[PDB]
Design a protein around this ligand. Structure first.
Ligand SMILES: CC(C)(CO)NC(=O)c1cccc(Cl)c1
Length: 291
């Protein structure tokens, strides 16, 4: 799967909020472009003169993520984060010249991402009470991954001593994206666990944090809540469910070619971190069938 690379696989079946530290620093920002950020401004002007109802928004930038030695006490993950924007994304990662910026970054800074906005996404492996994962169909009329299958998520917007507020906004935002798009009550959702971080190589390497969230509703109740919002209550054009039993072999199915890269990330990390049992009981042949 060339379109997705794993940057981080979390231990212990996934990390809760209380085990993560963030360092939010201007040292973690995008570097100014070699010929100046005028190139970004020019692409933005062109875009607004065709779609003048568009608006900029701030975004978190992922610089890097360092895991503690496995089995250790105390904080287990440090997220190094800067600030970017939708405007910077359109002028770098989404640009036709994104590959040239990656090569220049290797040359100038020894870092393929040095000149890229790299806004941090969030996604969820959302499981039902009757043991299905939730999938959404994208419109065939949007610019990114039209007509492809996605999981719930988005790109959160800003507002250890400012760090803990940043980790809280990241975990909060995955729940908020589930409530906005699936139309679920917040009280049917578990506190999220961070499974890992996945890179979209089709979008010049921008990263998404992938979370596990459990819902107390069955698949039939989740469907009712989704549909009862009506066409204007969601961006997606349909919802569907795959048994967790069948998610194990999803990369061998015809569905795999229809999944956008970030949803592939979420499924690979669910299979490695929540699936793949380590103990004698769940690892027994009757409960973990060979092949
Ligand atoms: C077309 C829209 C407005 C749909 O939500 N695009 C985004 O919000 C978006 C996509 C990729 C990256 C970042 Cl930062 C934003």
């Amino acid at each position: 799967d060339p379109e997705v690379t794993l940057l981080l696989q979390c231990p212990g079946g996934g990390l809760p909020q209380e085990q993560i530290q963030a360092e939010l620093s201007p040292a973690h920002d995008r570097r100014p472009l070699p010929g100046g950020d005028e190139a970004i401004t020019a692409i933005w002007e062109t875009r607004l003169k065709a779609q003048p109802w568009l608006f900029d928004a701030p975004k978190f930038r992922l610089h890097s993520a360092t895991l503690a030695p496995i089995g250790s006490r105390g904080p287990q993950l440090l997220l190094r984060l800067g600030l970017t924007s939708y405007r910077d994304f359109l002028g770098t990662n989404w640009s036709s010249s994104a590959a040239w910026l990656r090569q220049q970054g290797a040359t100038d800074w020894g870092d393929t991402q040095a000149y890229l906005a790299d806004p941090l996404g969030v996604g969820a492996a959302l499981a039902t009470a009757d043991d299905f994962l939730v999938f959404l169909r994208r419109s065939r009329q949007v610019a990114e991954a039209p007509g492809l299958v996605d999981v719930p998520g988005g790109h959160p917007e800003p507002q250890d001593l400012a760090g803990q507020l940043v980790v809280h906004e990241l975990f909060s935002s995955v729940l908020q994206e589930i409530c906005d798009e699936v139309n679920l009550p917040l009280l049917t959702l578990s506190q999220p666990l961070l499974l890992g971080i996945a890179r979209n190589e089709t979008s010049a390497g921008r990263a998404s944090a992938e979370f596990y969230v459990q819902c107390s509703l069955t698949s039939e109740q989740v469907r009712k809540h989704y549909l009862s919002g009506g066409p204007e209550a969601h961006e997606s054009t349909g919802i569907f469910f795959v048994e967790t039993q069948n998610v194990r072999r999803l990369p061998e199915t015809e569905m795999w070619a229809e999944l956008c890269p970030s949803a592939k990330g979420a499924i690979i990390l669910y299979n490695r971190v929540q699936g793949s049992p380590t103990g004698a009981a769940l690892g027994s042949p009757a409960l973990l069938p060979p092949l």
